[PDB]
């Protein structure tokens, strides 16, 4: 039902837990990832990452990065 | 006047040449051409192709006499914008130190540019002067010089003669036949290369001959299609019909804006291929 998501920075952890759906802004287009997706490495745009937990909403502004 | 009658006269060129009995007389029909040899001239075509050629050198005579080497005047500013654009177009293509290519590029581009610029004038206006001067209402006459396949062929065949000449001059007959038979496919042993020599000859000779032919016919095709499409839109009014003449106004108004692409591209393609083709005749491309 969920995948283990970890949001991190060079200084400290930002989030860690279990999520159903992850929406992130990739450099060539956005991604909507769910459990069992084959390996993906991508460069992230500066913007909001939206997480889904068993069907509440959170928003965080990030200055760029990578999604693995 | 009928639509077919309007079109039928305008499609024929003025020819003077060798009749079976001597070097004097004008040709009156297409059928008459089968007895005739190589020796004739299109009198309308030579006058018009030479006229704008003199005008290009005349604009340089006018411009060189008044060059400031400082602040440009109102008229020469417009000429500098055209020269700066042409110089930029040559610089964005040629990086070498050959002295023949640059004056050739300027001459070819500006001559084709002026010959193409006159395509906006009515087809029926220019023929009437030649007819009245000759005293013949049946005189065949075409003004537009770049819409004759011989004009584009004269430019591509002469450039091709320089390309082939420089290739044979530096590599010799034995080396030239070697390039034409041992490339692009090659072998370490003779028995395999002998099966490839006819294939190599079939590839290199055909591709070599296709350069002057494609340049002349592509440039002629684009220019002929340019004049022919404008002439056909003009036939709506030429038909004498009320509805077709009334309808033509909307189509003509929308259509008129198009000619600047033909002027820019057709002059540019000859330049772009000429710089490259003359550069590849002094080195091994295989």
């Amino acid at each position: 039902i969920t995948v283990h998501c970890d949001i991190v920075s060079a200084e400290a952890e930002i989030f860690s837990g279990l999520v159903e759906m992850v929406i992130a802004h990739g450099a060539l287009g956005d991604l909507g990832i769910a459990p069992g997706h084959a390996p993906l490495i991508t460069d992230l745009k500066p913007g909001p990452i939206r997480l889904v937990k068993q069907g509440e909403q959170e928003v965080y502004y990030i200055s760029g990065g990578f999604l693995e | 006047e009928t639509a077919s009658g309007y079109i039928q006269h305008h499609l024929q060129n003025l020819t003077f040449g060798r009749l079976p009995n001597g070097d004097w007389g004008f040709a009156h029909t297409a059928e008459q051409a089968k007895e005739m040899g190589f020796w004739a001239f299109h009198v309308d075509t030579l006058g018009w192709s030479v006229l704008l050629g003199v005008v290009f050198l005349f604009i340089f005579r006018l411009a060189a006499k008044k060059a400031t080497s400082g602040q440009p005047g109102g008229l020469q500013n417009f000429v500098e914008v055209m020269v700066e654009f042409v110089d930029t177009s040559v610089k964005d293509t040629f990086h070498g130190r050959n002295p023949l290519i640059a004056p050739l590029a300027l001459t070819v581009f500006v001559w084709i540019f002026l010959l193409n610029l006159i395509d906006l004038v009515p087809v029926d206006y220019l023929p009437m002067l030649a007819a009245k001067i000759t005293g013949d209402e049946h005189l065949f006459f075409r003004a537009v010089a770049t819409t004759d396949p011989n004009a584009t062929l004269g430019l591509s065949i002469s450039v091709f003669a320089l390309i082939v000449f420089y290739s044979i001059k530096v590599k010799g007959i034995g080396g030239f036949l070697g390039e034409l038979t041992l490339h692009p496919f090659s072998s370490k042993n003779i028995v395999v290369q002998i099966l490839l020599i006819p294939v190599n000859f079939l590839l290199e000779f055909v591709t070599l001959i296709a350069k002057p032919v494609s340049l002349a016919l592509r440039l002629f095709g684009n220019m002929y299609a340019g004049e022919l499409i404008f002439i056909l839109i003009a036939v709506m009014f030429g038909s004498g019909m009320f509805l077709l003449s009334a309808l033509g106004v909307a189509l003509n108004w929308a259509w008129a804006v198009f000619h600047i692409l033909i002027i820019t591209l057709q002059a540019f393609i000859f330049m772009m291929l000429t710089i490259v083709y003359l550069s590849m005749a002094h080195e091994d491309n295989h």
Binding site: - | N13, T15, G17, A27, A30, A33, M36, F38, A40, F41, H42, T45, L46, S49, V50, G53, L57, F60, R61, A63, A64, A67, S69, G70, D87, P99, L100, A102, P103, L104, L106, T107, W111, D148, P149, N150, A151, L153, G154, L155, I157, S158
Partner: protein, 52 residues
């Protein structure tokens, strides 16, 4: 003759106009580009030279 009569006149004319222009018309105008560019380059050098 319908189409073939123009093949000889244009070949001679093109080769003549290119060589004639290359020797008596083109060279006098292109020299001005080396000059105009140098008028600005000398002005830019003068600014660095005065400060130095």
């Amino acid at each position: 003759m319908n189409i073939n009569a123009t093949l000889i006149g244009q070949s001679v004319a093109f080769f003549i106009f290119v060589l004639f222009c290359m020797k008596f018309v083109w060279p006098p105008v292109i020299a001005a580009l080396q000059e105009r560019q140098k008028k600005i380059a000398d002005g830019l050098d003068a600014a660095n030279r005065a400060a130095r």
